[PDB]
Curated annotation (Swiss-Prot):
Gene: menC
Pathway: Quinol/quinone metabolism; 1,4-dihydroxy-2-naphthoate biosynthesis; 1,4-dihydroxy-2-naphthoate from chorismate: step 4/7; Quinol/quinone metabolism; menaquinone biosynthesis
Protein name: o-succinylbenzoate synthase
Originating species: Salmonella typhimurium (strain LT2 / SGSC1412 / ATCC 700720)
Keyword flag Magnesium: yes
Any one Gene Ontology molecular-function term assigned to this protein's record: magnesium ion binding
Residues the record lists as binding Mg(2+): 163, 192, 215
Enzyme class: lyase
Family from the record: Belongs to the mandelate racemase/muconate lactonizing enzyme family. MenC type 1 subfamily.
Catalysis: reaction(s): (1R,6R)-6-hydroxy-2-succinyl-cyclohexa-2,4-diene-1-carboxylate = 2-succinylbenzoate + H2O
NCBIfam families linked: menC_gam_Gplu, PRK05105.1
Length: 322
């Protein structure tokens, strides 16, 4: 189409030392961007499969994105199934049509990074609603239970999101719970995927009174949105999910069941994170998104996250594929 043109960029962002995912060292974050133009209209997307979580590799995503772009340029925008590519391409399309609103709040649940005191100091005097995120299942269960307990004790109105990524056996999950004072358990907003199996996670929720959330379950073939005793939320990671339309359908299905839906990071670059902030403000206006992952990186690119002190690279500094 005479009116259409596109650009594709490839990049690698250095990570801070000490970032681990499913027994892996994420030394750099590797990804792609697409920039679509149709007349005076422009739209961007991020295509960044996450090692150990995405089925597709960076290299596979690159090929799929390029071939999708080739078709789009010729007037065919049907999206591929590959989730990171479907997500990025769909965001670019949504930006071209103005469907993705410009607005964002740019606030996220702060992520604990090994210093609960700092987290306490940061939240203890924050006016309004206090929500934070603690990763669990990396250290031994006793440690996690004590940390969670101390934080809840330190700030009486703090609500914690906990993320286990299916780390625990039923025994370890019970060991974690025993260190959390029952008087404080109601202030665990949710514990994402405590156990290795979903049935064990549900049993844990019912036994302990600690609310749970689904995250990786949503990407399993069998997944059905269900209201269930103990289940309070779902975590939706668009890069691992697919198109913006699919993300919308999932948010809607969760809300229709009274479940909280959290728009969440797959460690995207700043560009993708700002888009997730817009998606969250639009589709989940009442729910703080899980986007506090930028500080794990050494640079921003193209669009900065407001308030980040990290340097921001311009597009001219990235490797251009198309
Ligand atoms: Cl290549
Ligand atoms: Cl730029
Ligand atoms: Na636009
Ligand atoms: Na999670």
């Amino acid at each position: 189409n005479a009116m259409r043109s596109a650009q594709v960029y490839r990049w690698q962002i250095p990570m801070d030392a000490g970032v681990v995912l499913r027994d892996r060292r994420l030394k750099t974050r590797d990804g792609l961007y697409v920039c679509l133009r149709d007349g005076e209209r422009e739209g961007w997307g991020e295509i960044s499969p996450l090692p150990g979580f995405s089925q597709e590799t960076w290299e596979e995503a690159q090929t799929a994105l390029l071939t999708w772009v080739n078709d789009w340029l010729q007037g065919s925008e049907g999206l591929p199934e590959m989730p990171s590519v479907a997500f990025g391409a769909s965001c670019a399309l949504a930006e071209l049509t103005g469907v993705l609103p410009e607005a964002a709040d740019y606030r996220a649940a702060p992520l604990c990074t090994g210093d609960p005191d700092d987290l306490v100091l940061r939240l203890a005097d924050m006016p309004g609603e206090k929500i934070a995120k603690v990763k669990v299942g990396l250290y031994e269960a006793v440690r996690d239970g004590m940390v969670v307990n101390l934080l809840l004790e330190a700030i009486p109105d703090l609500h914690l999101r906990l993320d286990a990524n299916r780390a625990w056996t039923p025994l370890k999950a019970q060991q974690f719970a025993k260190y959390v004072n029952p008087d404080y358990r109601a202030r665990i907003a949710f514990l994402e995927e405590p156990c290795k199996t979903r049935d064990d996670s549900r049993a844990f929720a019912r036994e302990t009174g600690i609310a749970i959330a689904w995250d990786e379950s949503l990407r399993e073939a069998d997944f059905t949105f269900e209201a269930e005793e103990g289940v309070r939320a779902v975590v939706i990671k668009p890069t691992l999910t697919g198109s913006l339309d699919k993300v919308r359908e999932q948010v809607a299905a969760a809300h229709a069941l009274g479940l909280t839906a959290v728009i969440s990071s797959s460690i995207e670059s700043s560009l993708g994170l700002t888009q997730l902030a817009r998606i969250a403000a639009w589709l989940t206006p009442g729910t703080l998104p899980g986007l506090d992952t930028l500080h794990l990186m050494q640079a921003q690119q193209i669009r900065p996250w407001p308030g980040s002190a990290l340097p921001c690279l311009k597009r001219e500094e990235l490797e251009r594929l198309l």
